[PDB]
Design a protein around this ligand. Structure first.
Ligand SMILES: Nc1ccn([C@H]2C[C@H](O)[C@@H](COP(=O)(O)NP(=O)(O)OP(=O)(O)O)O2)c(=O)n1
Ligand SMILES: [Mg+2]
Ligand SMILES: [Mg+2]
Ligand SMILES: [Mg+2]
Length: 381
DNA sequence: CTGGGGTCCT
DNA sequence: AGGACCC
């Protein structure tokens, strides 16, 4: 029943890709910018006070010498992401992606086969690779300790393969479920790894200072729980199941309370190929239907390239907008003939479709403006 | 001065 | 179609 899970999280991912592209920025403090957001920075810049998701005014005010590179085109980051995932898939085929830079791998079967090859004189020689969370003592006679140590070794081999084959560094966490692996992977950063033995689970879980630090408890749930007087992990652990179900529904309640105990039975799922391909473009102002139409042509060209490279075809298209004060969208199926002709002028029909979808949302006869235009291709087969 | 992506559930 | 969550 007991699993060995690894979580891998790349060091300052976008920035790391930019530093590999141009080594002139290797030792300069570097931030990757998307409009007015420094979505990440390398660690040199973190030493001078730059933080992830700072806006660029605060970034340059805390660090006026910060070199900034534009990261609004995700192409290189995306390619690198899938190179990491495929490398990990070589170890065990079932790899779950989370964002562009995190991967879960279930090492249970691998650990088992490694232990079955070992002979009883060297079950005593098993050693950890990397950090043991909270300096907990290893008990070599504890089978769970043994298999988590093997997991730490596989994790080290994974990170070394990532470095030697792709030039990327990152952190790994080995634990008995996805939640604990992801929580322990960030304990020693950057480019380090930690293993969590079971006796320390509670310690790990109570090291958190607010519930929103738990993956699965987002902005809305956190705000609700705060309204309920729940602020610590122990608050949520000890809170009434009934009341919590009443305000969050049965699903959210049971899941996040189990999570607050460090319990997580969810399996590592094979991510495989993406379920969708989208591109966004935000701006201060779009009020011309001709302008929006040009934006939409542009997003669509790149999207066509990408979907054609995949080698499977989308069967639904969606357009998304944002009005100046949430988001709104309209989708529709992609006609069969246009679908058959992907990768012929697919562009003009797709444009007409997307523009009709556009006018369904926005009244051209009245005046408007828009702050975000996005196109998504989903329902791939 | 709040990007640009993704997942699954309702 | 929207909402919640993840990075
Ligand atoms: N809200 C977010 C979060 C992440 N990202 C991108 C930029 C990051 O380089 C990348 C990886 O996410 P991340 O791991 O949270 N941050 P990053 O890897 O840069 O730093 P560390 O993981 O080293 O702390 O996703 C984004 O564009 N918008
Ligand atoms: Mg990450
Ligand atoms: Mg990272
Ligand atoms: Mg959270």
């Amino acid at each position: 029943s007991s699993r060995v899970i690894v979580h891998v999280d790349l060091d300052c991912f976008y920035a790391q890709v930019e530093m590999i592209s141009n080594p002139e920025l290797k030792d300069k403090p570097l931030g990757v910018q998307q409009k007015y957001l420094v979505v990440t920075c390398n660690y040199e810049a973190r030493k001078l006070g730059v933080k992830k998701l700072m806006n660029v005014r605060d970034a340059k005010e805390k660090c006026p010498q910060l070199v900034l590179v534009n990261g609004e085109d995700l192409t290189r980051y995306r390619e690198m992401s899938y190179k990491v995932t495929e490398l990990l898939e070589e170890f065990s085929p079932v790899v779950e992606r989370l964002g562009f830079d995190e991967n879960f791998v279930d090492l249970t079967e691998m650990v088992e086969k490694r232990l079955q090859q070992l002979q009883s004189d060297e079950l005593s020689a098993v050693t950890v690779s990397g950090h043991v969370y909270n300096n907990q003592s290893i008990n070599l006679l504890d089978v769970l300790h043994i298999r988590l140590l093997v997991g730490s070794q596989i994790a080290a081999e994974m990170r070394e393969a990532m470095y030697n084959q792709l030039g990327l560094t990152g952190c790994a966490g080995v634990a008995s479920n996805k939640l604990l692996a992801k929580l322990v992977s960030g304990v020693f950063k950057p480019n380090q790894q930690t293993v969590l033995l079971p006796e320390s689970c509670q310690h790990l879980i109570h090291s958190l200072n607010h519930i929103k630090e738990i993956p699965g408890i987002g902005y809305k749930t956190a705000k609700c729980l705060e309204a309920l007087g729940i602020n610590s992990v122990r608050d949520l652990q000890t809170f009434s199941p009934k009341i919590l179900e009443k305000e969050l529904g049965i699903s959210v309640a049971q899941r996040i309370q189990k999570l607050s105990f460090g319990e997580d039975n969810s399996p590592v799922i094979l991510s495989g190929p993406p379920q969708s391909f989208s591109e966004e473009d935000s701006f201060k102002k779009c009020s011309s239907e001709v302008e929006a139409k040009n934006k939409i042509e542009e997003l669509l060209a790149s999207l066509l390239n990408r979907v054609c490279q995949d080698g499977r075809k989308p069967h639904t298209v969606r357009l998304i907008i944002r009005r100046y004060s949430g988001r709104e969208s309209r989708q529709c199926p992609i006609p069969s003939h246009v679908i058959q002709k992907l990768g012929y002028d697919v562009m003009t029909p797709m444009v007409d479709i997307l523009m009709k979808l556009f006018r369904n949302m926005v009244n051209v006869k009245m005046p408007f403006h828009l702050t975000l235009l996005s196109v998504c291709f989903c329902n791939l087969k």
